[PDB]
Amino acid sequence: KKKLHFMYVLLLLFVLLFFVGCGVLLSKKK
Structure with missing residues (x-):
């Protein structure tokens, strides 16, 4: 089961x- 969580x-x-x-990308201008 831990194999999935990992x-x-x-x-x-x-x-x-x-x-x-x-x-x-946005902070670059707006």
Whole structure:
């Protein structure tokens, strides 16, 4: 069961970089 959780927890690291990635796109002007 932990095999699944260990696969999702690594996704979170991608989520943060995903949101901040677009944050600079908009903050660049508006």
